[PDB]
UniProtKB/Swiss-Prot annotation:
Function: RNA exonuclease that binds to the 3'-end of histone mRNAs and degrades them, suggesting that it plays an essential role in histone mRNA decay after replication. A 2' and 3'-hydroxyl groups at the last nucleotide of the histone 3'-end is required for efficient 3'-end histone mRNA exonuclease activity and degradation of RNA substrates. Also able to degrade the 3'-overhangs of short interfering RNAs (siRNAs) in vitro, suggesting a possible role as regulator of RNA interference (RNAi). Required for binding the 5'-ACCCA-3' sequence present in stem-loop structure. Able to bind other mRNAs.
Organism in which the protein naturally occurs: Homo sapiens
Protein name: 3'-5' exoribonuclease 1
Consequence the record notes for mutating M111A: Inhibits RNA-binding to the stem-loop structure and 3'-end histone mRNA exonuclease activity
Record entry for activity regulation: Although it can bind simultaneously with SLBP to the 3'-end of histone mRNA, the presence of SLBP prevents the exonuclease activity.
Binding site for Mg(2+) 2: D10, D110
The entry's keywords: Cytoplasm, Disease variant, Dwarfism, Exonuclease, Hydrolase, Intellectual disability, Magnesium, Metal-binding, Nuclease, Nucleus, Phosphoprotein, RNA-binding, RNA-mediated gene silencing, rRNA processing
Catalytic machinery residues: E12 (proton acceptor), H169 (proton acceptor)
Portion of the full sequence shown: 125 to 349 of 349
Temperature dependency: Optimum temperature is 37 degrees Celsius.
Gene: ERI1
GO terms for cellular component: cytoplasm; histone pre-mRNA 3'end processing complex; nucleolus; nucleus
Enzyme class: hydrolase
Domain Exonuclease: start-end pairs: 6-182
Amino acid sequence: SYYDYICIIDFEATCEEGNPPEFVHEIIEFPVVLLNTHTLEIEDTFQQYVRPEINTQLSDFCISLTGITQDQVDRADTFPQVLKKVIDLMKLKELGTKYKYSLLTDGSWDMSKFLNIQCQLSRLKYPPFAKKWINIRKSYGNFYKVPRSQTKLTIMLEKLGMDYDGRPHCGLDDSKNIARIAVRMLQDGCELRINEKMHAGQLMSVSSSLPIEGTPPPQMPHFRK
Ligand SMILES: Nc1ncnc2c1ncn2[C@@H]1O[C@H](COP(=O)(O)O)[C@@H](O)[C@H]1O
Ligand SMILES: [Mg+2]
Ligand SMILES: [Mg+2]
C-alpha cells in the first residue's frame, strides 16, 4: 500500500554566474514540505538556512538569484547541525516508524549533486534515508508522455494550468509548488513512486514496476572517519 507522506526537499546552493563547471556548491537553504497523501494537504513546512564553510561569501549572482542574503547565511547553522534538525523534525512527524513515507525532489540534482557534494564537504556519511527518491520531473515525463525538456518546473505548471506561487529560487516556495504538482498528479491518477537512486555515488534509475517500499526512518549519519 501507498506512502502516507511525501517529503519534498528542494535545496538552494551557492553558485556563480555562467555556472562555472568546477565551482564547489554548498547547500545554503534546506526546506522540508510534508505532503499527506491521504488528505492531499501540505501538513508541515520547515525552512532553515545553512552557513557555507568553503566559499563562505555568497556571490552577487547568488544573492540575487535566490534572494538569500549574506547576513542570513552568516547567522545560520552549519550543514551537519541543520541536518540533525531536519532529522529531528522527521522523527517528530514519525516518518519511517508510524508512517510510510518517501522523498520527492524536482529533478535529480538535489540528492545526487547538492546533498552528495555537501556530505563530502561536511565529512558525513551520505544518509541512507536519502539514497532513493521520486524525481517528479521523471514521473511527469513518463505519466504525461513528454520529452525531458518539457518537464522544467515552468512548463509543468503552465501545462497543468497553474501558477508559480511566491518567489522563484526560494527553496521553500519552490518545494510548495512542487508539492502542488504532486497533488495534482496524484489526482490525475498517477501513482508517484521512487524512480531514482544513488549507487556507488552515481545516479541510477529504479524500476517503476516494483512494489511500493517505504524509506527507512531517518538516522543522523556519523562523521566519516
Ligand atoms: N541560472 C542558474 N545559474 C546558476 N546556478 C543555478 C541557476 N539556477 C539554479 N541554480 C543552482 O541550483 C540551485 C537550486 O535550483 P532551483 O531549484 O532552480 O532554485 C540554486 O541555488 C543554484 O545554486
Ligand atoms: Mg532545486
Ligand atoms: Mg529551488
